Amino acid sequence: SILATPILIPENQRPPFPRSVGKVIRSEGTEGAKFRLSGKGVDQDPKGIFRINEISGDVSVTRPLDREAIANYELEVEVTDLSGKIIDGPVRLDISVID
Ligand SMILES: [Zn+2]
Ligand SMILES: [Zn+2]
C-alpha cells in the first residue's frame, strides 16, 4: 500500500527553494520502484510547483505559494516499477496552503 499524508504549507515562504514539505511512504519500500506525482501543480497548469523524489518519496515545493491564488492542491501519487508500470496507487495527496 501507499500512505499519503496531507501536507500543510505556510503561505508565502521565503527561499531558498526547493523545500521539502512532506513524504509519501510505500509499505513495501522502493526497491525496483519509482514514486510518480501528477496533477494541477505538477504536470498540469500550474506546472512544476511540486515534485516527488522517485526513491525516497520526499515531496518538495519549488516556489512561494499564494493562498489567495490557489489555496489547495489535490495531487495523485503512485508507484511504478522501473519500466513505468503502476504497481501501487494512485492515492490522493492533499496539499493545503495555510495562512
Ligand atoms: Zn504496496
Ligand atoms: Zn529519475
Find the 38 Cα to ligand 2 centroid distance in Å: 15
**Determination technique used:** X-ray
Q: Kindly identify the ligand whose nearest atom is closest to the C-alpha of 30.
A: 1
Q: Kindly identify the ligand whose nearest atom is closest to the C-alpha of 52.
A: 2
Give the Cα separation of 57 and 9 in Å (integer): 17
Find the 88 Cα to ligand 1 centroid distance in Å: 5
- State the resolution, in angstroms: 1.1
CB-based neighbours (< 5 A) of ligand 1, an ion: 1, 27-28, 88
CA distances from 48 to 13, 38, 52, 84 (A): 16, 10, 11, 20
The values of phi and psi at residue 54, to 5°, are -60, -35
Give the Cα separation of 55 and 71 in Å (integer): 28
Enter the C-alpha cell of residue 12: 508565502
Enter the C-alpha cell of residue 68: 489567495
SS (H, E, C) the chain: CEECCCEEEECCCCCCCCEEEEECEECCCCCCEEEEEECECCCECCCCCEEECCCCCEEEECCCCCCCCCCEEEEEEEEEECCCCEEEEEEEEEEEEEC
Residue 13 near residue 99, CB atoms below 8 Å: no
Q: Kindly identify the ligand whose nearest atom is closest to the C-alpha of 34.
A: 2
Domains of the chain in start order, with CATH, are 1-99 (2.60.40.60)
